[PDB]
Design a protein around this nucleic acid. Structure first.
Lengths: 123, 56, 137, 97, 84
RNA sequence: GCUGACGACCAUAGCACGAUGGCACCACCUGAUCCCUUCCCGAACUCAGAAGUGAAACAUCGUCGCGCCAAUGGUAGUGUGGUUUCGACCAUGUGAGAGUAGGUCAUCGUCAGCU
RNA sequence: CGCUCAACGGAUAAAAGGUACUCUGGGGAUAACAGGCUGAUACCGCCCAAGAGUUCAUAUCGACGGCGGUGUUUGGCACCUCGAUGUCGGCUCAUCUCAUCCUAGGGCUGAAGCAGGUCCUAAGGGUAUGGCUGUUCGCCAUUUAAAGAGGUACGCGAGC
RNA sequence: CCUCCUAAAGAGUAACGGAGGAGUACGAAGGUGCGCUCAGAACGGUCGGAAAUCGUUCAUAGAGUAUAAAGGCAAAAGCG
RNA sequence: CGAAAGCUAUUUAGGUAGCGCCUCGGACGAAUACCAUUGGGGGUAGAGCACUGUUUCGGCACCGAUGCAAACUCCGAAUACCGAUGAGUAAUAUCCGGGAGACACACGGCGGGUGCUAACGUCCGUCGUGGAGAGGGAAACAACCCAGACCGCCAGCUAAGGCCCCAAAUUCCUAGUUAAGUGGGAAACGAGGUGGGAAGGCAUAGACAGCUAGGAGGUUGGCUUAGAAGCAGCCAUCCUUUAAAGAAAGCGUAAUAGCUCACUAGUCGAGUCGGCCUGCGCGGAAGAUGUAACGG
């Protein structure tokens, strides 16, 4: 698995060796019966849209990122339970950090790449 | 014929018709006893508030 | 994952699960049944898990019947959403279970192994359960 | 195996509260109807009825209800048991002729 | 709003009440012109002594006592005004 | 005894199946000049009639195959007062639906006609 | 007879914005902080045991499902405060919890030994310094027996 | 503004509750008298079939009702 | 004497107006309320599949079994509501006019919508209480339970709740249960706690347990598999010496091997075994200033 993280979104790719198997978009079978947010997951936090009951002077942004990555890991674990493959975390160093601290099964992580470009638009 | 009806519990917080059944028997307070004719129409008033009153 | 086919209305009122299961309280299809002693909602995920357990234990040698079908759409509000602004979207389907209800029946297999298959299935269900045999009256 | 002892059930042990209060005395209400005369309301002991019901031929044979004296030839027609607890709650008997 | 769930489903309309139903019940005194039933369609049919308006309102054509009955081959509910 | 008209009632009155009826009555039936009909048609409506037949229809009679009606008992619910582990339970008053036993091939009124 | 006077009991025949340059009267009738209620979500724990573990469900891990505990994340509510309860971080100074990071005692082990892994007991002490960034955190360098998780108005501005 | 539900078997009854419609049409689609009965299925029949028109037999309405829905509709309120 | 925090409308939403609710005066006088008997219409709770849907199994959309539904109903209560008749009791009902206030309601039950059958949440309906209500109880505690304070009394009886001490009143009586301080927080689930109740199985033709001896031969059943030899898995459960011994219930081996078990015989000698239901208990059970989850 490739978990692509961003402050704004998360993507999930299934990859065999050096090719992409699937992208985990709206038209997939593995996301049909999901109890969590399906990929691609947008970070539609109340702080991201500017409502909800929080202020920027509270400095809760790191906590918000941690909880968003926790929800991302929930979706990742839900999908992984049906296939059980190792995952590679791609993203900024700080995002990878937050995700590693939040991951429910951090033993299945085999690699982390932080120098990959175009996390949100690249294919 | 007549019967004696006594009030045992307070009627202050009862349903409106139960209060009205007390007042239609003639009962006005706890431990008040009245004598009323023993007809089905009065016995229905006693039945309505049988938890509130006793018949001698 | 059982679910109704086309339905008449997307969303439903909560309702009240009250009373005993006077209907569906008899082993009517197989010889052997798992009956609910308590009331609740039988989610379609729970139905499927207890069906896969039973099937894996009976091993294509017997027959299983499911007497619960999830036909009640249950809505949920998403996180970070205030009260109001309409009724939430449908997320899953439950069956209303009352005490006495059959949930599964087994036929065509040893009583001991059918007992342990239903005992395995009861562990996936949010009900206190009893195991009953089919009677005449 | 096909003979059961019963007791009369009078009009004061009939009704919802009376039936509930009678089942709290380890008794099962039952009605014998059919033949060519009025139905008779009886009460059968719960343990006796449970033991009688254990026999699978009890449902398809001629039974003999002995109500402390007068005796009747009957066939069980209906048996409503508890939906969840499973114990018998009421029995129907049809008088054969 | 994390799972994209809450969204537009606009239905907050409803019409005003119409105050239908039986106005004068069986056995009551009635004077001519009094409305007995306000209804949609002939849920009740006018028997002897009662007429029907353009909106299927049943009203008394004469003084008397209102009677409800089921009669005819269609088992229709009928309201009558008997001269009592 | 039977037939016809108009009603009460609106399945315990219905359906299905079988039998009986032509002296009155009814129904088919004959014809289409005339009255009146057909977006064409004497099919229906209508008129003028009795050669034939109760075939169909209709009426009556028979039955339980279906329908329909339907207890008793129990159960569910429920008003009031109380309790409760909120499922319910207790006292009292009510009391289904479903199902079972069972019932049913209707019952009456006014008038006319044949016997 | 002439109204999408449709904000449809229709303010005028006739009408948009900005204010971080601002101001007044009010409100905890109503939001942002912190408390409270709640516990969906979260975190922790437990139940079942498909499977992985070369064999072997239960050394270790635990798919599909189920049940709790905590208040602890993200939330829900609007009960307290708008005739004022100062916000994040740092500094200083702490105090408590135990779901224990080290040190102590153990059972099991896929425990030869050395090292570990899990779980049980255990809160007496102890539990880095730096580079980056306002950061909390995080990454990194080098250590250490260890660099614990939290509560305390996310402790502490009438202490900085 | 209308229809259903919420609405707890008289009426009424709220929510940024769950579902739909209206802001018309028609001088006949109004009045009356008279007359008629639908949808579907099966069987037979030139083109012609799954389905056109024709004939037969079942068929309380499974149709229609200018339109949303509900309630009604055989004395049809449906169709000439 | 005594509300309201409702309805309708509103550039209205914390304002105001009409109506509702309060008061005063006048008119009228039983037209009002309660209950009994009785005349009504209903589509709710429940129930059901006849319609609209939805659902599972079998036979072949249809037949049969089997479920479910606010916007489904072949049905269908209780209450409630609208009438009639009648007794008793009652500081009634209605109308005209003077003066208002109120149009932020709250909680606890009941029936629902919403929410997560979350919220001291929100929105209706209905009852009670508070508001505007003191007194007693619930440790303390508007809204819960009992009960409505005109004033005075060093009189008595009771309600809810209580009676070992704080603290008024039983260390009261009868029959039991619990050993957990359960009582005096917490579930799935686990267990050989303990009491009770309906039945069963076996037994001096020696029952249960222990101990002693055996537990075998076709055969390593066939297949599959590197290997599958009772014991990975798939397909049968046969026969033989038998007092008995499974084509095996476990441990074990890579597979065999090996150790047990089921079962039988012997020893001993009397009751014993396992399910079902029920009462009360046990574990599951970790938090932050201090015992701190009976007020002590």
């Amino acid at each position: 698995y490739t978990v692509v993280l961003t402050r704004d979104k998360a993507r999930l790719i299934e990859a065999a060796n050096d090719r992409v198997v699937a992208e985990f978009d709206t038209d997939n079978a593995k996301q049909n019966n999901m109890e969590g947010i399906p990929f691609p997951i947008d970070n539609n936090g109340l702080y991201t849209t500017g409502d909800g009951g929080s202020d920027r002077s509270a400095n809760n942004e790191n906590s918000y990122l941690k909880e968003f990555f926790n929800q991302v890991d929930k979706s990742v674990q839900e999908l992984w339970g049906e296939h059980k493959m190792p995952l590679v975390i791609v993203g900024d160093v700080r995002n990878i950090s937050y995700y590693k601290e939040v991951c429910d099964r951090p033993e299945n992580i085999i690699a982390t790449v932080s120098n990959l470009t175009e996390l949100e638009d690249g294919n | 014929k007549t019967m004696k009806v006594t009030q045992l519990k307070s009627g202050a917080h009862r349903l409106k018709s139960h209060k009205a059944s007390l007042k239609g028997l003639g009962l006005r307070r706890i431990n008040h006893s009245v004598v009323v004719e023993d007809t089905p129409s009065t016995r229905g008033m006693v039945n309505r508030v049988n938890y509130l009153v006793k018949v001698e | 994952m059982l679910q109704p086919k086309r339905t008449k209305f997307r969303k439903m009122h909560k309702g009240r699960n009250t009373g005993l299961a006077h209907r569906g309280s008899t082993v009517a299809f197989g010889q052997f049944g798992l009956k609910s002693l308590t009331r609740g909602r039988m989610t379609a995920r729970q139905i499927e898990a207890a069906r896969r357990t039973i099937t894996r234990k009976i091993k294509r040698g017997g027959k299983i019947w499911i007497r619960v079908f999830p036909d009640k759409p249950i809505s949920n509000k998403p996180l970070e959403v205030r009260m109001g602004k309409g009724k939430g979207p449908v997320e899953y389907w439950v069956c209303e279970i009352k005490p006495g209800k059959m949930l599964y029946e087994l036929e065509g297999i040893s009583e001991e192994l059918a007992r342990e298959a239903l005992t395995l299935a009861a562990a996936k269900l949010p009900f206190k359960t009893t195991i009953v045999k089919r009677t005449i009256m | 195996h096909f003979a059961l002892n019963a007791v009369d059930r009078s009009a004061e042990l009939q009704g919802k509260g009376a039936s509930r209060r009678l089942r709290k005395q380890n008794l099962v209400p039952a009605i014998i109807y059919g033949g060519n005369e009025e139905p008779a309301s009886i009460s059968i002991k719960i343990n006796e009825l449970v033991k009688a019901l254990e026999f699978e031929a009890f449902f398809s044979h001629i039974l003999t209800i002995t109500v402390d004296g007068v005796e009747e030839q009957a066939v069980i027609k209906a048996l409503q048991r508890h939906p969840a607890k499973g114990f018998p709650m009421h029995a129907d008997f049809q008088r054969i002729v | 709003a994390h799972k994209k769930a809450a969204g537009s489903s606009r239905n907050g309309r409803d019409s005003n009440p119409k105050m239908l139903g039986v106005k004068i019940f069986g056995g009551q005194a009635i004077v001519a012109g009094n409305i007995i039933v306000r209804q949609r369609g002939t849920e009740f049919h006018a028997g002897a002594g009662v007429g029907m308006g353009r909106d299927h309102t049943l009203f008394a054509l004469n003084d008397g006592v209102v009677k409800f009955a089921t009669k005819g081959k269609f088992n229709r509910r009928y309201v009558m005004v008997e001269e009592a």
